[PDB]
Amino acid sequence: DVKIEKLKDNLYVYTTYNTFNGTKYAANAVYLVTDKGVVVIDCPWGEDKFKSFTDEIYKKHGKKVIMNIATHSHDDRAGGLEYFGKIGAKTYSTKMTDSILAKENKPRAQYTFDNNKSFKVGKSEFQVYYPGKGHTADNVVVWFPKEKVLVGGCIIKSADSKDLGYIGEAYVNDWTQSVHNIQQKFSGAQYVVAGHDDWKDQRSIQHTLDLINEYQQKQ
Ligand SMILES: C[C@H](CS)C(=O)N1CCC[C@@H]1C(=O)O
Ligand code: NA
Ligand SMILES: [Zn+2]
Ligand SMILES: [Zn+2]
Ligand SMILES: [Zn+2]
């Protein structure tokens, strides 16, 4: 199942679901429809959902995916690099993410960049920004200036998150500064999209900071 909702103009938020030990988690990402084709950020959470996802893209827009950008090495972000490459899309990731994928023997992106990069596709513009370590050492966010949408990915927890989620590769002591960096640089954001679960509640950044503090206080 893939849920797709228009967020602003040609920018859409898509959500897929993956159940872990009785807890049904949602993974949120976005895709942009341009005159040159569709740009997909991250990927459906689960390989058995890739075809269903692009099938929905065709049903709704009758267009082709020409680019895929992974915001970190995990399955819900970089899991589709092989698939999107196979169907003709130009794939990207940061060099740090590439190093992690290589180490884990996971498919890698065709092109890599040094943490930050500004993109221009058709008449659309967006930028990938590295705020520092948090959920992982390589996590990046994507900013769409025209739509005023900040795709936070997993460094941003949903306002209803019970805990920080998977922290086996996290840097909790650096996470607060990284989130403060995002907040300061994209202060005028109309929409901030958390990587998991409910993203609509815009207190997501506040709750994230709350969860980090809670974790640290408990030592
Ligand atoms: C929970 C994260 C996504 S934030 C996840 O999918 N992981 C963490 C380690 C195993 C799996 C993966 O990406 O390989
Ligand atoms: Na590899
Ligand atoms: Zn992750
Ligand atoms: Zn995630
Ligand atoms: Zn809170």
UniProtKB/Swiss-Prot annotation:
It catalyses: a beta-lactam + H2O = a substituted beta-amino acid. Substrate binds at residue 157. The keyword Magnesium does not apply. It is an enzyme of class 3 (hydrolase). It is found in: Periplasm. Binds 2 Zn(2+) ions per subunit. Keywords: Antibiotic resistance, Hydrolase, Metal-binding, Periplasm, Signal, Zinc. The keyword RNA-binding does not apply. One of its GO terms (biological process) is response to antibiotic. Its cofactor is Zn(2+). Zn(2+) 1 binds at residues 72, 74, 135. GO terms for molecular function: beta-lactamase activity; zinc ion binding. Zn(2+) 2 binds at residues 76, 154, 196. One of its GO terms (cellular component) is periplasmic space. Its EC number is 3.5.2.6. Inhibited by chelating agents such as EDTA, 1-10 phenanthroline and pyridine-2,6-dicarboxylic acid. Belongs to the metallo-beta-lactamase superfamily. Class-B beta-lactamase family. Monomer. Confers resistance to the different beta-lactams antibiotics (penicillin, cephalosporin and carbapenem) via the hydrolysis of the beta-lactam ring. This is Metallo-beta-lactamase type 2. It comes from Elizabethkingia meningoseptica (Chryseobacterium meningosepticum). The chain holds residues 27 to 222 of 249 of the full protein.
